[PDB]
Design a protein around this ligand. Structure first.
Ligand SMILES: CCCc1c(F)c(F)c(S(N)(=O)=O)c(F)c1F
Ligand SMILES: CCCc1c(F)c(F)c(S(N)(=O)=O)c(F)c1F
Ligand SMILES: OC[C@H]1O[C@@H](O)[C@H](O)[C@@H](O)[C@@H]1O
Ligand SMILES: [Zn+2]
Length: 257
């Protein structure tokens, strides 16, 4: 199956997922000079006060922190979005070294990692139906740089030892995703896709301009996870990022002047 190595990574995905060469693939490089302020964007509303985290899972590609999405407990609205999008999970992409790891780039600069908060459009009733729609998903992307520690990330870091290998999960209740946000909600937005197979072109991307800072020790613990399952030879879970894809007939809009 697909992965991030030389024999099953991003340059191979198109053979089983031909949309990999499609017209609105993600991630992309964000050329900050070409992005244009869009006065039609409404204020962005991140409403995570009632979020209910449930579980953390190593899926062999990354780790997902999963939420209860049976009600509008944690929703994203506003900005470029029409209606209400419900948080289902978050996960990260990261590198083997601090100089790489993000999927989106900013004037070609790669960050050490990138956080994705995945939301589905409630007008479609379930995530599965949402990924049949051009406006089915909204992903809030947040860059990570290495500097001071992020206190709100530490609970995630400390549980990773219990989900080292593919297929392991652990209870992860009462986690507040608000502790992963930067101060500013200035953002860039464009239409794109899932960055993992099946690469479906369903996503409104909202990428925050301000990175969060995490400590070297925190990201080093990400890099101790394993792509492999228990009992199998160790393949460190690093460099689980897709590189930037062609922008094609798209414009990136900025929320800020
Ligand atoms: C073996 C093998 C591959 F060589 C490969 F390229 C892929 S792909 N196109 O999904 O990346 C696989 F799923 C796979 F199982
Ligand atoms: C495959 C369905 C689950 C899933 C998403 F919905 C999604 F949006 C992303 S991403 N990197 O584009 O944010 C994923 F990596 C991912 F695995
Ligand atoms: O025709 C002019 C229009 O061109 C579009 O490509 C831009 O997104 C708009 O901001 C601009 O007003
Ligand atoms: Zn992602």
């Amino acid at each position: 199956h697909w992965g991030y190595g030389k024999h099953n990574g991003p340059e191979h995905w198109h053979k089983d997922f031909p949309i990999a060469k499609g017209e609105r693939q993600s991630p992309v490089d964000i050329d900050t000079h070409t992005a244009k302020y869009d006065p039609s964007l409404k204020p962005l509303s991140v409403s995570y006060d009632q979020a209910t985290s449930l579980r953390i899972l190593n899926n062999g590609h990354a780790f997902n922190v999963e939420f209860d999405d049976s009600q509008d407990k944690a929703v994203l609205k506003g900005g470029p979005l029409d209606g209400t999008y419900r948080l289902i999970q978050f996960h990260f992409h990261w590198g083997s070294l601090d100089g790489q790891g993000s999927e989106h780039t900013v004037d070609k600069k790669k960050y050490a990692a990138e956080l994705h908060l995945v939301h589905w459009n409630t007008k479609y009733g379930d995530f599965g139906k949402a990924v049949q729609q051009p406006d089915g998903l909204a992903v809030l992307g947040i860059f990570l740089k290495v500097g001071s520690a992020k206190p709100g990330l530490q609970k995630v870091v400390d549980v990773l030892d219990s989900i080292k290998t593919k297929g392991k999960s652990a209870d992860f209740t009462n986690f507040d995703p608000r502790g992963l946000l930067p101060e500013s909600l200035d953002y860039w937005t464009y239409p794109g896709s899932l960055t993992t197979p099946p690469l479906l072109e369903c996503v409104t991307w909202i990428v925050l301009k301000e990175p969060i800072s995490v400590s070297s020790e925190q990201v080093l613990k990400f890099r101790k996870l394993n792509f492999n399952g228990e009992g199998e030879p160790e393949e460190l879970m690093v460099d689980n990022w897709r590189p930037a894809q062609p922008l094609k007939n798209r414009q990136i809009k900025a929320s800020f002047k």
